[PDB]
C-alpha cells in the first residue's frame, strides 16, 4: 500500500524543472532590451544552484552509493553548458567568415528553441514514467 509518499518529493521537482525550461523559451520569444538577456542566464543559473543545496542536506549524492540526485545531475550539467553557448553566441557578432556552412535560413534561433522541448519532453516523461499510472 503505496500513497506515493517518497514520489512526491521527486514529482514535486518535476513541476519546477519543466516550468524553468518554459521561461527560457519566453524569453527568447520576447527579444526586448538586453538586461532580460542578462537577469535571464543569471536567473536559470540560480534555480539550479537552490537546488544543490536542496538535496546537499537531502541526502546528497556524496552520501551514498546509488544517489538518485547525482543523475538528473549529470543530464542538466550537459544541458546547461548548451545554454552557455547559445547566451555568448548571440553577445557577440561575427562579421563574415572564411567559410561557409551547409543550409540554414536564419532559423538557427527556432532550430534550437524546439530542439530543447524536445529533450525535456523525453527526460521529464522518461523519470515521470516511473509510476504505472497516476493512481500508484
Given at each position: 500500500n503505496?500513497e506515493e509518499?517518497?514520489?512526491?518529493?521527486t514529482?514535486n521537482?518535476?513541476?519546477?524543472?519543466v516550468?524553468?525550461?518554459?521561461?527560457?523559451?519566453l524569453?527568447?520569444?520576447?527579444?526586448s532590451?538586453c538586461?532580460?538577456?542578462?537577469?535571464?542566464?543569471?536567473?536559470?543559473?540560480?534555480?539550479?544552484t537552490?537546488?544543490?543545496?536542496?538535496?546537499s542536506?537531502?541526502?546528497?549524492?556524496?552520501?551514498?552509493d546509488?544517489?538518485?540526485?547525482?543523475?538528473?545531475?549529470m543530464?542538466?550539467m550537459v544541458?546547461?553548458?548548451?545554454?552557455?553557448?547559445?547566451?555568448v553566441c548571440?553577445l557577440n557578432v561575427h562579421?563574415?567568415s572564411?567559410?561557409?556552412?551547409?543550409g540554414?535560413?536564419?532559423?538557427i534561433?527556432?532550430?534550437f528553441?524546439?530542439?530543447?522541448?524536445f529533450?525535456?519532453?523525453?527526460?521529464?516523461?522518461?523519470?515521470?514514467l516511473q509510476p504505472?499510472?497516476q493512481e500508484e
Amino acid at each position: 500500500n503505496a500513497e506515493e509518499e517518497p514520489l512526491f518529493y521527486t514529482i514535486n521537482l518535476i513541476i519546477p524543472c519543466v516550468l524553468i525550461t518554459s521561461l527560457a523559451i519566453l524569453v527568447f520569444y520576447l527579444p526586448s532590451d538586453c538586461g532580460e538577456k542578462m537577469t535571464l542566464c543569471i536567473s536559470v543559473l540560480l534555480a539550479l544552484t537552490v537546488f544543490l543545496l536542496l538535496i546537499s542536506k537531502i541526502v546528497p549524492p556524496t552520501s551514498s552509493d546509488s544517489p538518485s540526485v547525482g543523475e538528473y545531475l549529470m543530464f542538466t550539467m550537459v544541458l546547461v553548458t548548451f545554454s552557455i553557448v547559445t547566451s555568448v553566441c548571440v553577445l557577440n557578432v561575427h562579421h563574415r567568415s572564411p567559410e561557409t556552412h551547409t543550409g540554414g535560413g536564419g532559423g538557427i534561433d527556432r532550430l534550437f528553441l524546439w530542439i530543447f522541448v524536445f529533450v525535456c519532453v523525453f527526460g521529464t516523461i522518461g523519470m515521470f514514467l516511473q509510476p504505472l499510472f497516476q493512481e500508484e
